[PDB]
Amino acid sequence: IIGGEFTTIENQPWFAAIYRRHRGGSVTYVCGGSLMSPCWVISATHCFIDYPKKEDYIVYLGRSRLNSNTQGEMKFEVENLILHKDYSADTLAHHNDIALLKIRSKEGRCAQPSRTIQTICLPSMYNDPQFGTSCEITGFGKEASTDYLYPEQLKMTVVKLISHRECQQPHYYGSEVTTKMLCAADPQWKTDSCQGDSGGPLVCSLQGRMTLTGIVSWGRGCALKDKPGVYTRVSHFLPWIRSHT
Amino acid sequence: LKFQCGQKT
Numbered sequence: 001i002i003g004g005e006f007t008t009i010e011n012q013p014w015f016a017a018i019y020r021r022h023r024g025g026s027v028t029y030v031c032g033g034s035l036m037s038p039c040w041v042i043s044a045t046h047c048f049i050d051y052p053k054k055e056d057y058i059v060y061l062g063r064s065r066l067n068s069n070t071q072g073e074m075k076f077e078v079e080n081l082i083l084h085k086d087y088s089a090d091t092l093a094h095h096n097d098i099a100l101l102k103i104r105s106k107e108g109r110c111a112q113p114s115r116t117i118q119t120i121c122l123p124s125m126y127n128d129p130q131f132g133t134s135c136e137i138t139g140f141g142k143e144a145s146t147d148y149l150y151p152e153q154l155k156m157t158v159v160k161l162i163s164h165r166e167c168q169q170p171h172y173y174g175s176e177v178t179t180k181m182l183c184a185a186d187p188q189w190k191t192d193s194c195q196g197d198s199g200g201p202l203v204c205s206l207q208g209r210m211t212l213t214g215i216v217s218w219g220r221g222c223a224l225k226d227k228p229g230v231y232t233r234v235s236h237f238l239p240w241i242r243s244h245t
Numbered sequence: 246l247k248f249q250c251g252q253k254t
């Protein structure tokens with residue numbers, strides 16, 4: 001996250017950290033995710049497309065730090081890895097960039113509710129907040145695009161939703177953004193999501209709840225002017241999610 | 246105990 005504040009999982013108790021193992025001895029962070037229900041985490045397909053070997057990923061819940069432990073964390077394995085079929089990566093965009101991971105702990109259970117582990121709400125069919133709404137994003141991604149390492153402490157920031165009309169302006173992203181995406185930016189282009197934040201949540205308040213409105217998907221640079229962050233529009237994938245829950 | 250999506254406290 002560029003800008004933002006450092007935080008603790010208690011402030012984002014539905015955030016999931018996904019890592020990959022290289023038996024060599026290291027586990028490296030891959031992307032973030034969000035807890036939908038006790039056994040299901042939702043993230044972005046582009047995070048797994050290149051190494052779709054479920055057996056090599058680990059998911060953690062209740063984690064405030066990237067490589068150190070947090071008391072209250074839960075470790076899980078990926079029982080099912082559902083990538084979207086018709087996922088496409090072009091020059092910038094990722095289409096149908098949503099993925100589901102069914103998790104299981106070494107004891108055989110799914111997540112248990114704690115002050116650091118909670119689920120996030122899903123929107124209703126094609127229901128979104130209106131542009132202007134402030135939403136928050138959270139993650140362990142880069143703090144500057146020139147960094148080659150990720151922060152050890154979790155971060156969060158607030159961004160606002162902008163219209164497609166504004167995001168599809170020729171000098172923003174043109175028609176690379178579709179109705180199945182949402183764009184969110186900082187009025188003063190100071191904070192934003194970046195590389196390492198993919199998969200994590202864009203949460204906004206809808207109908208009085210905190211809902212997962214989008215999934216961090218792509219963007220040109222990080223916190224650049226006229227280059228908003230693009231998120232997968234969860235509200236338009238409800239059927240897809242449902243057939244696998 | 247049980248989940249309540251969206252609730253932080």
Ligand SMILES: NC(=[NH2+])c1ccc2[nH]c(-c3ccc[nH]c3=O)nc2c1
Nearest residue numbers: 193194195217218219220221222229
């Ligand atoms: N501007 C954004 N909101 C944004 C979001 C996710 C990104 N992911 C990446 C990225 C950069 C390089 C390699 N892989 C990535 O996912 N850049 C990103 C930028």
